[PDB]
Amino acid sequence: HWQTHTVFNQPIPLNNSNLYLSDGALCEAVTREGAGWDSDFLASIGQQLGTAESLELGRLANVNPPELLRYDAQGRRLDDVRFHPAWHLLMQALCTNRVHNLAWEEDARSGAFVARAARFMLHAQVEAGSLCPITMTFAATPLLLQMLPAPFQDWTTPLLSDRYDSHLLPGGQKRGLLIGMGMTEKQGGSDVMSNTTRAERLEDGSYRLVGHKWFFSVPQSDAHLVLAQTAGGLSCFFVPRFLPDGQRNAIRLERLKDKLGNRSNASCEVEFQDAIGWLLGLEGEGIRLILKMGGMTRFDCALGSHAMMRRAFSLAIYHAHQRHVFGNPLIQQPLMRHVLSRMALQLEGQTALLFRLARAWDRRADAKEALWARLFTPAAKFVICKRGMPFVAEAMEVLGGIGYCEESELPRLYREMPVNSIWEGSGNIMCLDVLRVLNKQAGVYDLLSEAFVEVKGQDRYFDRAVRRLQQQLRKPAEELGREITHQLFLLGCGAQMLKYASPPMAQAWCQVMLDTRGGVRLSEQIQNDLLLRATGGVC
Amino acid sequence: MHWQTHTVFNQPIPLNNSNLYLSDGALCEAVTREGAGWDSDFLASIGQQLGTAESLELGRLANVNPPELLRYDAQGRRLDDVRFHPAWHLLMQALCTNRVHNLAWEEDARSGAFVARAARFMLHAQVEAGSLCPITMTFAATPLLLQMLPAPFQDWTTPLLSDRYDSHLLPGGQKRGLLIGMGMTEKQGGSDVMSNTTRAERLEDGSYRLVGHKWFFSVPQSDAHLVLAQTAGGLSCFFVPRFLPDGQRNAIRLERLKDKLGNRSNASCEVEFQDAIGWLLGLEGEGIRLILKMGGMTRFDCALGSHAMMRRAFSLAIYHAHQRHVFGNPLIQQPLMRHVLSRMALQLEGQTALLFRLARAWDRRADAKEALWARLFTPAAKFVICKRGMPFVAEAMEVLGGIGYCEESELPRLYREMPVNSIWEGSGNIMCLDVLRVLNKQAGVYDLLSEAFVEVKGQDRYFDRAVRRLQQQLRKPAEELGREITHQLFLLGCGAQMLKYASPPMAQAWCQVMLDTRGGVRLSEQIQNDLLLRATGGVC
Amino acid sequence: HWQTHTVFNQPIPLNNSNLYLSDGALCEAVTREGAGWDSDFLASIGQQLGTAESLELGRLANVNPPELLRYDAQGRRLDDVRFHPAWHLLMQALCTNRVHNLAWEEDARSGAFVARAARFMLHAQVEAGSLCPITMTFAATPLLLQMLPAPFQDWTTPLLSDRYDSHLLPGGQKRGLLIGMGMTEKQGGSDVMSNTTRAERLEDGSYRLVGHKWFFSVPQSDAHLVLAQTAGGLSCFFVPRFLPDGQRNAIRLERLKDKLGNRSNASCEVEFQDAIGWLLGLEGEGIRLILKMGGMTRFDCALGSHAMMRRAFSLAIYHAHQRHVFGNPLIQQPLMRHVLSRMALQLEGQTALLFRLARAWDRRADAKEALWARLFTPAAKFVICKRGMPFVAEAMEVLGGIGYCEESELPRLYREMPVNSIWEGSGNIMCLDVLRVLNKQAGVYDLLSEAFVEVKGQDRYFDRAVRRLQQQLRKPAEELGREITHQLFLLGCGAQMLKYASPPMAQAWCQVMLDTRGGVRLSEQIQNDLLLRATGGVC
Ligand SMILES: Cc1cc2nc3c(=O)[nH]c(=O)nc-3n(C[C@H](O)[C@H](O)[C@H](O)COP(=O)(O)OP(=O)(O)OC[C@H]3O[C@@H](n4cnc5c(N)ncnc54)[C@H](O)[C@@H]3O)c2cc1C
Ligand SMILES: Cc1cc2nc3c(=O)[nH]c(=O)nc-3n(C[C@H](O)[C@H](O)[C@H](O)COP(=O)(O)OP(=O)(O)OC[C@H]3O[C@@H](n4cnc5c(N)ncnc54)[C@H](O)[C@@H]3O)c2cc1C
Ligand SMILES: Cc1cc2nc3c(=O)[nH]c(=O)nc-3n(C[C@H](O)[C@H](O)[C@H](O)COP(=O)(O)OP(=O)(O)OC[C@H]3O[C@@H](n4cnc5c(N)ncnc54)[C@H](O)[C@@H]3O)c2cc1C
Ligand SMILES: [Cl-]
Ligand SMILES: [Cl-]
Ligand SMILES: [Cl-]
The number of the ligand nearest the C-alpha atom of B82 reads 5
**d(C-alpha A158, C-alpha B155), whole Å:** 52
Question: What residue ranges do the domains of chain B occupy?
Answer: 1-51+106-129+286-540, 52-105, 130-285
Q: What is the DSSP letter of C521?
A: P
Provide the greatest CA pair distance for chain B.
85
Q: What is the 3-state secondary structure (H, E, C) of C270-315?
A: EEEEEEEEEEECCCCCHHHHHHHHHHHHHHHHHHHHHHHHHHHHHH
**Ligand 2 atom 51, closest CA:** C401
Please report, as a single letter, which amino acid is at residue B43.
L
Angle at A220 between CA A219 and CA A226, to 5 degrees: 45
The residue of chain B with its CA nearest to that of C261 is B405
Please report, as a single letter, which amino acid is at residue B520.
G
**d(C-alpha B239, C-alpha B172), whole Å:** 12
**d(C-alpha A143, C-alpha C134), whole Å:** 61
Residue closest to A55 by CA, chosen among A123, A109, A115: A123
**d(C-alpha A453, C-alpha A447), whole Å:** 10
**d(C-alpha B78, C-alpha C513), whole Å:** 57
**d(C-alpha B180, C-alpha C278), whole Å:** 67
Question: DSSP of B157-203, one letter per residue?
Answer: HHHHT-S-----SS-GGGSSS--EEEE--BTTBSS-GGG---EEEE-
Contact by Cβ (8 Å): B32, B119: no
- Give B130-285's CATH code, choosing from 3.65.10.10, 3.20.20.70, 2.40.110.20, 3.30.870.10: 2.40.110.20
Q: How many helices (H) and strands (E) does chain C have?
A: 17, 11
Query: Angle, nearest 10°, between helix axes A24-32 and A112-126?
Result: 160
Q: Please, is C383 exposed, middle or buried when counting C-beta atoms within 10 Å of its C-beta (0-12, 13-18, 19+)?
A: buried
Interface of B with C in 101-160 (CB under 8 A): none
Provide the greatest CA pair distance for chain C.
85
**d(C-alpha B439, C-alpha B91), whole Å:** 40
Question: DSSP of B375-391, one letter per residue?
Answer: HHHHHHHHHHHHHHHHH
Contact C255 A71 (CB under 8 A): yes
**d(C-alpha B500, C-alpha B505), whole Å:** 12
Q: How far is CA A386 from CA A59, A376, A482, in A?
A: 24, 15, 11
Q: What share of chain B is helix, strand, coil (3-state, %, to 5)?
A: 55, 15, 30
Residues whose CB falls within 8 Å of the CB of residue C190, separated by 6 or more in sequence, listed in order: B326, B327, B401, C425, C426, C428, C429
Residues whose CB falls within 8 Å of the CB of residue B254, separated by 6 or more in sequence, listed in order: B69, B71, B80, B82, B220, B269, B270, B271
Residue A345 Cα to ligand 3 midpoint, Å, equals: 69
Q: How many helices (H) and strands (E) does chain B have?
A: 17, 11
**d(C-alpha C331, C-alpha C321), whole Å:** 5
Which chain A residues are Cβ-neighbours of B403 within 8 angstroms?
73-74
Enumerate the β-bridge partners of residue B225.
Answer: B181, B240
**d(C-alpha A214, C-alpha A422), whole Å:** 14
> Which residue out of B75, B84, B400, B413 would a mutagenesis test of the A interface target, given it has the greatest number of A Cβ atoms within 10 Å?
B75
Domain B52-105 annotated CATH 3.50.50.60: no
C503: number of Cβ within 10 Å: 11
Residue C268 Cα to ligand 3 midpoint, Å, equals: 15
Backbone angles phi, psi at A407, to 5 degrees: -70, -20
The residue of chain A with its CA nearest to that of C253 is A254
Does B504 contact ligand 3 (Cβ within 6 A)? no
**d(C-alpha C177, C-alpha C136), whole Å:** 11
Q: What is the DSSP letter of A103?
A: G
Contact A75 B275 (CB under 8 A): no
**d(C-alpha A300, C-alpha A139), whole Å:** 9
**d(C-alpha B70, C-alpha B78), whole Å:** 9
Q: How far is CA A202 from CA A208, A279, B183, B454, C521, in A?
A: 6, 11, 71, 83, 82
- Asked if B75 is an interface residue toward chain A (Cβ–Cβ < 8 A), one would say yes
Contact by Cβ (8 Å): B523, B508: no
**d(C-alpha C266, C-alpha C279), whole Å:** 26
Enumerate the β-bridge partners of residue B276.
Answer: B210
Contact by Cβ (8 Å): A52, A15: yes
B19: number of Cβ within 10 Å: 20
- Residue A69: in which H helix or E strand, if any? strand A67-71
Does B368 contact ligand 3 (Cβ within 6 A)? no
Q: What is the DSSP letter of B406?
A: B
Query: Angle, nearest 10°, between helix axes C334-362 and C481-500?
Result: 90
Calculate the CA C514 to chain-centre distance. 26
Q: Please, is C21 exposed, middle or buried when counting C-beta atoms within 10 Å of its C-beta (0-12, 13-18, 19+)?
A: buried
- Asked if C414 is an interface residue toward chain B (Cβ–Cβ < 8 A), one would say yes
**d(C-alpha B515, C-alpha B498), whole Å:** 13
Residue closest to C391 by CA, chosen among C272, C290, C509, C310: C310
Ligand 1 binding pocket, CB closer than 6 Å: A 181-184, 188-191, 215-217, 259, 262, 267, 419, 422-429, 432
Which chain A residues are Cβ-neighbours of B14 within 8 angstroms?
73
Which long-range contacts link B368-374 to residues 24+ away (Cβ below 8 Å)?
A: B369/B448, B372/B442, B372/B444, B372/B445, B372/B448, B373/B448, B374/B296
How was this model experimentally determined? X-ray
Enumerate the β-bridge partners of residue C369.
Answer: none
Residue C190 Cα to ligand 3 midpoint, Å, equals: 5
CATH topology agreement for domains C51-104 and C129-284 = no
Residues whose CB falls within 8 Å of the CB of residue C231, separated by 6 or more in sequence, listed in order: C201, C283
- Asked if A255 is an interface residue toward chain C (Cβ–Cβ < 8 A), one would say yes
Residues whose CB falls within 8 Å of the CB of residue C341, separated by 6 or more in sequence, listed in order: C522, C526, C527, C530, C531
- For residue A412, the SS3 value is helix
**d(C-alpha A146, C-alpha A132), whole Å:** 23
Contact by Cβ (8 Å): C414, B419: yes
Query: Angle, nearest 10°, between helix axes B445-455 and B482-501?
Result: 40
- By DSSP bridging, strand C251-256 and strand C233-240 are unpaired
- Asked if C74 is an interface residue toward chain B (Cβ–Cβ < 8 A), one would say no
Q: What is the DSSP letter of A326?
A: T
Radius of gyration of chain A (CA): 24
Residues whose CB falls within 8 Å of the CB of residue A70, separated by 6 or more in sequence, listed in order: A77, A78, A79, A253, A254, C254, C255
Enumerate the β-bridge partners of residue A277.
Answer: A207
Using the atom order of ligand 2, give the atom closest to the CA of residue B214. 11
**d(C-alpha C383, C-alpha C489), whole Å:** 7
**d(C-alpha A369, C-alpha B152), whole Å:** 72
Radius of gyration of chain C (CA): 24
What's the full length of chain B, in residues?
Answer: 540
**d(C-alpha C480, C-alpha C408), whole Å:** 39
Which chain A residues are Cβ-neighbours of B86 within 8 angstroms?
85
- For residue B64, the SS3 value is helix
Contact by Cβ (8 Å): B456, B504: no
- Residue B534: in which H helix or E strand, if any? helix B525-534
**Ligand 2 atom 4, closest CA:** B216
Residues of the binding site of C for FAD = 181-190, 215-217, 422-432
The number of the ligand nearest the C-alpha atom of A192 reads 1
Does C323 contact ligand 2 (Cβ within 6 A)? yes
Residues whose CB falls within 8 Å of the CB of residue C442, separated by 6 or more in sequence, listed in order: none
Q: What is the 3-state secondary structure (H, E, C) of B124-150?
A: HHHHCCCCHHHHHHHHHHHHHHHHHCC
Contact by Cβ (8 Å): B268, B257: yes
- Residue B268: in which H helix or E strand, if any? strand B268-281
Closest partner residue to A75 (CB to CB) among C1, C74, C214 is C214
Question: DSSP of A336-359, one letter per residue?
Answer: HHHHHHHHHHHHHHHHHHHHHHHH
**d(C-alpha C391, C-alpha C309), whole Å:** 7
**d(C-alpha B344, C-alpha B206), whole Å:** 55
- For residue C325, the SS3 value is strand
- By DSSP bridging, strand C67-71 and strand A198-201 are unpaired
A192: number of Cβ within 10 Å: 17
- Asked if B477 is an interface residue toward chain C (Cβ–Cβ < 8 A), one would say no
Interface of C with B in 3-42 (CB under 8 A): 4-10
Residue closest to C234 by CA, chosen among C225, C243, C242: C225
What count of Cα atoms within 13 Å lies in the side-chain half-sphere of residue B286?
8
Contact by Cβ (8 Å): A58, A87: no
Residue closest to B418 by CA, chosen among B435, B396, B401: B396
- By DSSP bridging, strand C251-256 and strand C223-230 are unpaired
Residue C309 Cα to ligand 2 midpoint, Å, equals: 22
Gaps in chain A with C–N over 2.5 Å, residue before each: none
Question: DSSP of B453-514, one letter per residue?
Answer: HHHTTTS-HHHHHHHHHHHHHTSS--GGGHHHHHHHHHHHHHHHHHHHHS-HHHHHHHHHHH
**d(C-alpha C451, C-alpha C463), whole Å:** 12
Q: What is the DSSP letter of A518?
A: -
B537: number of Cβ within 10 Å: 17
Please report, as a single letter, which amino acid is at residue B117.
R
Q: What is the DSSP letter of C406?
A: T
Question: DSSP of C471-516, one letter per residue?
Answer: HHTTS--STTHHHHHHHHHHHHHHHHHHHHS-HHHHHHHHHHHH-T
Residue closest to A129 by CA, chosen among A81, A191, A163: A81
**d(C-alpha C99, C-alpha C300), whole Å:** 11
A390: number of Cβ within 10 Å: 9
- Give A129-284's CATH code, choosing from 3.40.190.10, 3.90.1300.10, 3.90.950.10, 2.40.110.20: 2.40.110.20
Q: What is the DSSP letter of C246?
A: S
Please report, as a single letter, which amino acid is at residue B250.
N
Please list, residue by residue across B493-521, b when 16 or more beta carbons sit within 10 angstroms of its beta carbon and e when fewer do: bbbbbbbeebeeebbbbbbbbbbeeeebb
Please report, as a single letter, which amino acid is at residue C89.
L
**d(C-alpha C132, C-alpha C121), whole Å:** 13
Q: Please, is C3 exposed, middle or buried when counting C-beta atoms within 10 Å of its C-beta (0-12, 13-18, 19+)?
A: exposed
Enumerate the β-bridge partners of residue B249.
Answer: B243
Please report, as a single letter, which amino acid is at residue B215.
W
- By DSSP bridging, strand C179-182 and strand C223-230 are parallel
**d(C-alpha A248, C-alpha A268), whole Å:** 17
Positive/negative CA dihedral, A159, A165, A171, A172: negative
**d(C-alpha C313, C-alpha B327), whole Å:** 39
- Residue B216: in which H helix or E strand, if any? strand B207-218
**d(C-alpha B451, C-alpha B52), whole Å:** 44
Residues whose CB falls within 8 Å of the CB of residue B294, separated by 6 or more in sequence, listed in order: B140, B141, B144, B182, B226
- Give C51-104's CATH code, choosing from 2.40.30.10, 6.10.250.600, 3.50.50.60, 3.40.50.150: 6.10.250.600
Contact C255 A1 (CB under 8 A): no
- Residue C213: in which H helix or E strand, if any? strand C207-217
- For residue C452, the SS3 value is helix
Residue closest to A381 by CA, chosen among A226, A530, A492: A492
Residue C268 Cα to ligand 4 midpoint, Å, equals: 12
Residue closest to C32 by CA, chosen among C303, C352, C375, C347: C352
- By DSSP bridging, strand B224-231 and strand B180-183 are parallel
Residue closest to B243 by CA, chosen among B251, B235, B234, B253: B251
Closest partner residue to A269 (CB to CB) among C1, C75, C269 is C75
Radius of gyration of chain B (CA): 24
Q: What is the DSSP letter of B366?
A: T
Please report, as a single letter, which amino acid is at residue A66.
P
Please report, as a single letter, which amino acid is at residue C114.
V
Gaps in chain C with C–N over 2.5 Å, residue before each: none
Enumerate the β-bridge partners of residue B203.
Answer: none
**What residues sit around ligand 4, an ion, with C-beta below 5 angstroms?**
A 70-71
Contact B189 C325 (CB under 8 A): yes
Residue A422 Cα to ligand 1 midpoint, Å, equals: 6
Pinpoint the alpha helices (H) of B324-460.
335-363, 368-400, 410-423, 427-441, 445-455
- By DSSP bridging, strand A179-182 and strand A198-201 are unpaired
Q: How far is CA B114 from CA B102, B104, B119, B300, C323, in A?
A: 9, 5, 9, 11, 39
Pinpoint the alpha helices (H) of C107-217.
112-126, 131-145, 156-159
**d(C-alpha C471, C-alpha C452), whole Å:** 14
- For residue A34, the SS3 value is coil
Query: Nominal resolution in Å?
Result: 2.8
Calculate the CA B33 to chain-centre distance. 21
